């Protein structure tokens, strides 16, 4: 329930910052997940799009 899909483009070395508890320019200034996040994170390499 209450299902939402957040969506964005980041640099490949920044994929690791999406997970909760991380720091870095994305985790701190652009997009942050809560400590108790209950969803799923999925990502892929769109280097031809």
């Amino acid at each position: 329930t209450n299902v939402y899909a957040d969506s964005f483009v980041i640099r490949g070395d920044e994929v690791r910052q999406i997970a909760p508890g991380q720091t870095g320019k994305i985790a701190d200034y652009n997009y942050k997940l809560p400590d108790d996040f209950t969803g799923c994170v999925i990502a892929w390499n769109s280097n031809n799009l």
Binding site: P20, G21, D35, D36
Partner: protein, 49 residues
Amino acid sequence: LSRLDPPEAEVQIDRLITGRLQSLQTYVTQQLIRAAEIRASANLAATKM
């Protein structure tokens, strides 16, 4: 709490909370058994009085 974020700190704290209750339960049980013994002494003392 200073070194860990909430979700990690929670594990460490829960270990300490369980342990602290274990110490308190041990204490209460020992006081309760001793109370039974002091009561027996008090009953005898009342009888002798």
